[PDB]
Design a protein around this ligand. Structure first.
Ligand SMILES: CCCCCCCCCCCCCCCCCC(=O)OCC(COC(=O)CCCCCCCCCCCCCCCCC)OC(=O)CCCCCCCCCCCCCCCCC
Ligand SMILES: CCCCCCCCCCCCCCCCCC(=O)OC[C@H](COP(=O)([O-])OCC[N+](C)(C)C)OC(=O)CCCCCCCCCCCCCCCCC
Ligand SMILES: CCCCCCCCCCCCCCCCCC(=O)OC[C@H](COP(=O)([O-])OCC[N+](C)(C)C)OC(=O)CCCCCCCCCCCCCCCCC
Ligand SMILES: CCCCCCCCCCCCCCCCCC(=O)OC[C@H](COP(=O)([O-])OCC[N+](C)(C)C)OC(=O)CCCCCCCCCCCCCCCCC
Ligand SMILES: CCCCCCCCCCCCCCCCCC(=O)OC[C@H](COP(=O)([O-])OCC[N+](C)(C)C)OC(=O)CCCCCCCCCCCCCCCCC
Ligand SMILES: CC(C)CCC[C@@H](C)[C@H]1CC[C@H]2[C@@H]3CC=C4C[C@@H](OC(=O)CCC(=O)O)CC[C@]4(C)[C@H]3CC[C@]12C
Ligand SMILES: CC(C)[C@@H](C)/C=C/[C@@H](C)[C@H]1CC[C@H]2C3=CC=C4C[C@@H](O)CC[C@]4(C)[C@H]3CC[C@]12C
Length: 843
C-alpha cells in the first residue's frame, strides 16, 4: 500500500500545485489586470488635469477617482463595491477596444483579399519546485502584462489626449472665426436658448475642467485626435494618388507601398462606416422611432416621448441593445412582409429598388468598395427617411393622435397597473415571454400565413382596380381601367354616377376624346357620360433583379407596338450613369442576365396614384392589425368574463384574491389593452384560420411544442435544474456534516463552518457541471428524451442523495440518547467505510 500510496500523495500534490497555479493566474489576470488598467487610466487623467480629485490621498484617488460619490468613506464594503464598479468599467472599455480592433482588422483583411480592390489600386497608381517554477512564469507574465498595459495606455490615451487638447483648441479657434464671419454676414427664446445653454455648459465643462466625471468630456480630446488622424489618412491617400494614373506609372516602390497601405485604410474606414451605419445605426434609430410611436404610447404614458430609457435605468447603455433588438425585429418582419407581397401578389418588377433577399448578383463588399460613399450614404438616408415615415406615421398616428384624441379611448393603452417600469421587473418579463411564445405559435401554424396572403391579395386587387394601377401593380387589367369616365355634369359625376354610366350604352365600346365628349354632351341629352382614354403605355423592368444601368432606360413611354413615343436621350443617361458611378465605374460589371421589360399601362398622375396606393396599404394594414387585436381581446374577455370567472366565483369564492384579480383584469380589459388577452385571442383565431380559409374559398399540442421546444426555455430550465441540484446537494452536505459528525462529537467559530460550506459548494458546483456536461450531449435530443434524462439525473443526484443520508436522520430525530448517537455514528462510519473501500479498490 505504501508505494502507490506515496505516489497518490504525489498526485494530490500535483493537483494542488495545478489548482494553485490556475487559481492565482486567473485571479490576477481577471482582477488585477483590469484594476491595473483602471489605476493607470486614473493616474494618466490626473497627470492631464495636473491635480488629483482628492489631493494628498492617492489611494482614494486611485480607488474612487473622478466619480460622483460625494466624499465616499474608506469602508472595506464600500471599497469592494467601488472596485467591482471599476472592474466593470474597465472590462467594458477593454471589450469595446478589442472588438473595434478585431472588426477593423477583419475589414482590412477582407478588402485586401478582394480582387476588385487590386483593380482599384492598379487604376489609381498604375502599372510598375516545479510548482514554484510555474508560478514564476505566471508572475513574470503578469508583470509583462502590467508593463504592456502601462505602455499601451500611455501611447493610446495620454499622448492622444494631449494632442487632442492642442487640436481641439485650434478647432475651437477656427470655429470662433467662422462664427465671427457668419455674424458679420448676418449683420451686413425657449428652444434655441435651451440649446445654447446646454452647449455653453458643455464648453465650460471642457474648458474650465468642471465636468471631470463625464465619459464623453474625458474622451473628447482623444476622440478628436483619432478622428483627425483618420481624416489625414483618408486625404493623404488621394494626395499621394494625385497625378499618377493608369497611364502615368508609379515607378517608386516605397511610395507605391505607402499608397497601398493608405488606400487600404481609406477603404477600410469607408466600408466600416457604411456597414456600421446599416447594421447598427439603421436598426438602432428604427428602434428609437418604434419606441417613440408604438411602445411609449402603449406601455407608458402618451405624454412621455421615450420608454426604453426608463426601463433601462439600471444600466442605460443597455437601451442601445434594446433599441437594436426592436429595430432589427421590425426590419425582419417588414422584410418578411415585402417578401410575401413580392412572391405572390404584385407584378415581378415593381419593387426593384428594394433589395432582393435571393439575388445571385449580390457582392456586398465589391459594391461597398466601388460605389462612391456619398451615393451609398444618400441611398441609406432616403431609405431611412422612408422607414421613418412608415414607423412614425403608421403606428404613432393610431397610438398618439387617433385613439387618445379623436376617439378619446384608451383602447390602445396598457392599464396603469400593468405598465412595465424596469427591464428586470416581472411585468416586462411576462409581457415579453407572452409575446415571444405567441409569435412562436403563430409562426408554427400553417394556416395563418396563407390566410394573410389571401387577405392581402384581395386588398391589393381592390385598391389597384380602384386606382387604375392594376396593370402596373398586378400585371392584369381590364380595358376599362385605361381611361376615366367623363360626365356631363358634376351631378352625373357624383350624385348620379350609376345612372349616368347606365345611360351610355356605348361607354366601353367606343373611345371619345375629352373635347369630343364635351361636344357630345352639348349636342345630346340622353347620354351624360363618356369614356375618355388617358395615360400612356410604358416599359417597366420585368424582374426585381435588374442591373441599375438597365433601370435608367426602362421607364419610357411606348406605343402599342413597343415603339418609343420619344427618342431616348442616350447622352443624358450616360451622364447620369457617370454621376451614379465614380472613378471606379468600369470596374463594376453588372450582370444583364435578368434585364427584360414588360409593357404596362400607367395612368396619369402616377406619383399621386401610387402614393395613394401606399396610403391605402397602410390603412388596410392598420385595419387588419387593429381588428385582429381588438377581436382577440374581446373574444378572450367574453370567454373570460362570462365563462371561467363565474365558475371561479362559485368554486374559489367571491372574495378570493385570484377571483378579484381576474375580475378587475377583465373589467379593465373592456376599456384598456391587455397584451395577454390579445395574444391568447391571436392563438384562438390562428386555430380558426383553417375554417376561415375553407369557408371563404391541436391548441394544447402547439402551445406545448412552442414552449418546451424553444432554446430559450430549454436553456432556462437546464440552468435552473443545475442550480437546484447544486444547492440541494450543498444543503445535504452541510446538514449531514453539522447535524451529524459535529453533533456527535459535541455529545461525546462560524468561520470554519463557512469554510467547509464553501468547500462543499465548490464540489457540488462540480457535480452540477457534470449535469452541464450532460446538457450539451442532450441538447438536440427529443423532448421526451430530454425530460427523461433530466428527471433521472435530478432524481439520482438529488433525491437519492436526500434519502441515503438525510431521511434516516429525519426518522431517528437514558438509553435512547446513546442509541440515537451511536446509530448516527455507525451509519456515518459505514458510509465512510464504503467510500474508502471503493476508493481503495480503484486505487
Ligand atoms: C399586441 C399588441 C397590440 C399592438 C397594436 C398594433 C397597432 C397597429 C397599428 C397599425 C400599424 C400599421 C402597420 C403597417 O405599417 O403596415 C405595413 C405592413 C407590414 O408592417 C410590419 O411588418 C411591421 C412590424 C412591426 C413590428 C414591431 C416589433 C417590435 C418588437 C416587438 C417584440 C416582439 C417579441 C419578440 C421577442 C424577441 C425575439 C428574439 O403591415 C402588415 O402587412 C401586417 C400583416 C400582418 C398583421 C397581423 C398579423 C396576424 C397574426 C395573428 C393572426 C391571427 C389569426 C388571423 C386569422
Ligand atoms: C454585444 C452585446 C451588446 C449588449 C448591449 C451593451 C451595449 C454597450 C454600449 C456601450 C457601453 O455600454 O459603454 C458604456 C461604458 C461605460 O459604462 P458605465 O460608465 O455606465 O459603467 C458600466 C458599469 N457600471 C455600471 C458597473 C459602472 O463605456 C466605457 O466603458 C468607456 C467608453 C470608451 C471606449 C473606448 C474605446 C473606444 C471604442 C469605440 C466604440 C466601440 C464600438 C464597438 C462596436 C463595434 C461593432 C463592429
Ligand atoms: C475611434 C475611437 C475613439 C476612441 C477614443 C477613446 C477615448 C476613451 C476615453 C474614455 C474616458 O474618458 O475614460 C476616463 C478613464 C479615466 O477615468 P477614471 O479612471 O478617473 O474613472 C472614471 C469613471 N467614470 C467615468 C465612471 C466616472 O480613462 C481610461 O480608463 C483610459 C482608457 C483609454 C482607452 C483608449 C483606447 C483607444 C483605442 C483607439 C483604437 C481606435 C484606433 C483608430
Ligand atoms: C406593444 C408591443 C407589441 C408588439 C407588436 C408585435 C406585432 C407584430 C406583427 C407583425 C407581423 C407581420 C410580419 C409579416 O408580414 O409576416 C408575413 C409572414 C410571411 O410568411 P412567409 O414564411 O411566406 O415569409 C416570407 C418571407 N421570406 C421568404 C422573405 C423569408 O407571415 C407570418 O409569419 C405570420 C406570423 C407573423 C408573426 C406574428 C407575431 C405576433 C406577435 C404577437 C401577436 C400580436 C397580435 C397583433
Ligand atoms: C431607396 C428607396 C427604397 C427604400 C426601401 C424601404 C422602402 C419599403 C417599401 C416602400 C415602397 C414605397 C417607396 C417608393 C419609392 C420609389 C423610389 C423609386 O426608386 O422609384 C422609381 C420608379 C420610377 O419613377 P418615375 O415614374 O418617376 O420614373 C423615373 C424614370 N427614370 C428611372 C428613368 C428616372 O418609381 C416606381 O416604380 C414607383 C413604384 C412604387 C410601387 C409601390 C408598390 C406598393 C406595394 C406595397 C409595398 C409597400 C409596403 C409598405 C407600406 C406600408 C405603409 C405604412
Ligand atoms: C456608444 C459607444 C460607446 C459604443 C457603441 C456600441 C453599440 C453601437 C452596439 C450595441 C449593440 C451592438 C450590436 C450588437 C450585436 C451585433 C450583431 C452583428 O451581426 C452580424 O455581424 C451579422 C453577420 C452575418 O451573419 O453575416 C452586427 C453588429 C451588432 C449589431 C452590434 C453593433 C454595435 C452595437 C449596435
Ligand atoms: C493628429 C496627427 C496628425 C498626429 C498628432 C499623430 C498622432 C499619433 C500619435 C496618433 C495618430 C494615430 C494614433 C494611433 C493609431 C493606431 C493605434 C493602434 C491602437 O491599437 C492603439 C493606439 C494607436 C497606436 C494610436 C497611437 C497614437 C496615434 C499614432
Amino acid at each position: 500500500f505504501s508505494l502507490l500510496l506515496s505516489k497518490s500523495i504525489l498526485t494530490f500534490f500535483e493537483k494542488a500545485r495545478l489548482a494553485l497555479t490556475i487559481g492565482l493566474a486567473a485571479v490576477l489576470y481577471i482582477i488585477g489586470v483590469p484594476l491595473v488598467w483602471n489605476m493607470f487610466g486614473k493616474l494618466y487623467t490626473m497627470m492631464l488635469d495636473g491635480s488629483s480629485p482628492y489631493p494628498g490621498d492617492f489611494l482614494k484617488s486611485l480607488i474612487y477617482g473622478y466619480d460622483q460619490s460625494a466624499t465616499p468613506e474608506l469602508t472595506t464594503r464600500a471599497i469592494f463595491y467601488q472596485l467591482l464598479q471599476n472592474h466593470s468599467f474597465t472590462s467594458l472599455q477593454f471589450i469595446m477596444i478589442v472588438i473595434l480592433h478585431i472588426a477593423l482588422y477583419f475589414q482590412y483583411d477582407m478588402i485586401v483579399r478582394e480582387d476588385v480592390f487590386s483593380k482599384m489600386v492598379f487604376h489609381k497608381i498604375g502599372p510598375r519546485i516545479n510548482l514554484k517554477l510555474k508560478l514564476l512564469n505566471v508572475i513574470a507574465y503578469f508583470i509583462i502584462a502590467v508593463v504592456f498595459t502601462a505602455i499601451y495606455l500611455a501611447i493610446s490615451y495620454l499622448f492622444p489626449t494631449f494632442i487632442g487638447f492642442g487640436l481641439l483648441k485650434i478647432y475651437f479657434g477656427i470655429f470662433k472665426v467662422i462664427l465671427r464671419g457668419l455674424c458679420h454676414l448676418y449683420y451686413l427664446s425657449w428652444i434655441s436658448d435651451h440649446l445654447i445653454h446646454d452647449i455653453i455648459y458643455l464648453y465650460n465643462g471642457y474648458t474650465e475642467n468642471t465636468m471631470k466625471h463625464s465619459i464623453f468630456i474625458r474622451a473628447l480630446p482623444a476622440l478628436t485626435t483619432y478622428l483627425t488622424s483618420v481624416s489625414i489618412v483618408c486625404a493623404s491617400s488621394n494626395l499621394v494618388s494625385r497625378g499618377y494614373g493608369r497611364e502615368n506609372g508609379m515607378s517608386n516602390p516605397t511610395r507605391r507601398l505607402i499608397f497601398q497601405i493608405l488606400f487600404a485604410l481609406k477603404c477600410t474606414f469607408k466600408v466600416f462606416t457604411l456597414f456600421f451605419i446599416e447594421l447598427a445605426g439603421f436598426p438602432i434609430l428604427a428602434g428609437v422611432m418604434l419606441d417613440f410611436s408604438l411602445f411609449c404610447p402603449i406601455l407608458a404614458s402618451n405624454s412621455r416621448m421615450l420608454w426604453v430609457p426608463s426601463i433601462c435605468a439600471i444600466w442605460p447603455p443597455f437601451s442601445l441593445f434594446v433599441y437594436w433588438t426592436i429595430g432589427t425585429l421590425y426590419m425582419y418582419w417588414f422584410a418578411k412582409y415585402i417578401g410575401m407581397i413580392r412572391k405572390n401578389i404584385i407584378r415581378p418588377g415593381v419593387l426593384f429598388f428594394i433589395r432582393s433577399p435571393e439575388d445571385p448578383n449580390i457582392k456586398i463588399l465589391h459594391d461597398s468598395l466601388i460605389h462612391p460613399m456619398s451615393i451609398q450614404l444618400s441611398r441609406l438616408c432616403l431609405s431611412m427617411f422612408i422607414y421613418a415615415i412608415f414607423i412614425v406615421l403608421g403606428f404613432g398616428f393610431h397610438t398618439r393622435i387617433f385613439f387618445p384624441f379623436m376617439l378619446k379611448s384608451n383602447l390602445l393603452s396598457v392599464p396603469e397597473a400593468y405598465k412595465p417600469t424596469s427591464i428586470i421587473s416581472w411585468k416586462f418579463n411576462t409581457i415579453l415571454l407572452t409575446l415571444y411564445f405567441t409569435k412562436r405559435i403563430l409562426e408554427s401554424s400553417s394556416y395563418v400565413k396563407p390566410l394573410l396572403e389571401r387577405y392581402w391579395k384581395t386588398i391589393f386587387k381592390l385598391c389597384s382596380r380602384k386606382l387604375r394601377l392594376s396593370s402596373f401593380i398586378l400585371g392584369k387589367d381590364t380595358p376599362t381601367e385605361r381611361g376615366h369616365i367623363v360626365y356631363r355634369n358634376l351631378f352625373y359625376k357624383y350624385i348620379a354616377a350609376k345612372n349616368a354610366e347606365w345611360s351610355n350604352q356605348e361607354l366601353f365600346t367606343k373611345p371619345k376624346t375629352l373635347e369630343q365628349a364635351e361636344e357630345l354632351f352639348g349636342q345630346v341629352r340622353d347620354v351624360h357620360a363618356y369614356f375618355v382614354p388617358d395615360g400612356v403605355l410604358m416599359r417597366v423592368p420585368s424582374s426585381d433583379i435588374v442591373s441599375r444601368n438597365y433601370v435608367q432606360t426602362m421607364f419610357v413611354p411606348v406605343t402599342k407596338d413597343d415603339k418609343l413615343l420619344k427618342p431616348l436621350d442616350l447622352e443624358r443617361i450616360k451622364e447620369r450613369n457617370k454621376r451614379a458611378a465614380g472613378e471606379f465605374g468600369y470596374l463594376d460589371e453588372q450582370n444583364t442576365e435578368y434585364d427584360q421589360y414588360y409593357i404596362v399601362y400607367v395612368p396619369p398622375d402616377f406619383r399621386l396614384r401610387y402614393m395613394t396606393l401606399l396610403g391605402l396599404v397602410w390603412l388596410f394594414a392598420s385595419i387588419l392589425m387593429l381588428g385582429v387585436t381588438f377581436i382577440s381581446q374581446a373574444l378572450i374577455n367574453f370567454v373570460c368574463s362570462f365563462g371561467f370567472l363565474p365558475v371561479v366565483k362559485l368554486l374559489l369564492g367571491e372574495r378570493n384574491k385570484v377571483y378579484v384579480a381576474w375580475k378587475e383584469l377583465s373589467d379593465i380589459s373592456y376599456s384598456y389593452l391587455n397584451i395577454y388577452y390579445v395574444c391568447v385571442g391571436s392563438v384562438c383565431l390562428s386555430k380558426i384560420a383553417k375554417d376561415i380559409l375553407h369557408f371563404t374559398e391541436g391548441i394544447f399540442m402547439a402551445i406545448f411544442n412552442s414552449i418546451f421546444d424553444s432554446m430559450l426555455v430549454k436553456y432556462n430550465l437546464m440552468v435552473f435544474i443545475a442550480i437546484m441540484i447544486a444547492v440541494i446537494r450543498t444543503m445535504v452536505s452541510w446538514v449531514v456534516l453539522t447535524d451529524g459528525i459535529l453533533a456527535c462529537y459535541n455529545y461525546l467559530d462560524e468561520s470554519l463552518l463557512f469554510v467547509v460550506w464553501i468547500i462543499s459548494s465548490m464540489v457540488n458546483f462540480g457535480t452540477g457541471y457534470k449535469s452541464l456536461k450532460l446538457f450539451f450531449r442532450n441538447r438536440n435530443t427529443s423532448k421526451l428524451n430530454f425530460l427523461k434524462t433530466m428527471a433521472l439525473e435530478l432524481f439520482k443526484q438529488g433525491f437519492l442523495h436526500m434519502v441515503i443520508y438525510v431521511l434516516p436522520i429525519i426518522i431517528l430525530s437514558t438509553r435512547m440518547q446513546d442509541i440515537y448517537f451511536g446509530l448516527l455514528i455507525a451509519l456515518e462510519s459505514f458510509t465512510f467505510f464504503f467510500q474508502a473501500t471503493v476508493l481503495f479498490i480503484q486505487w
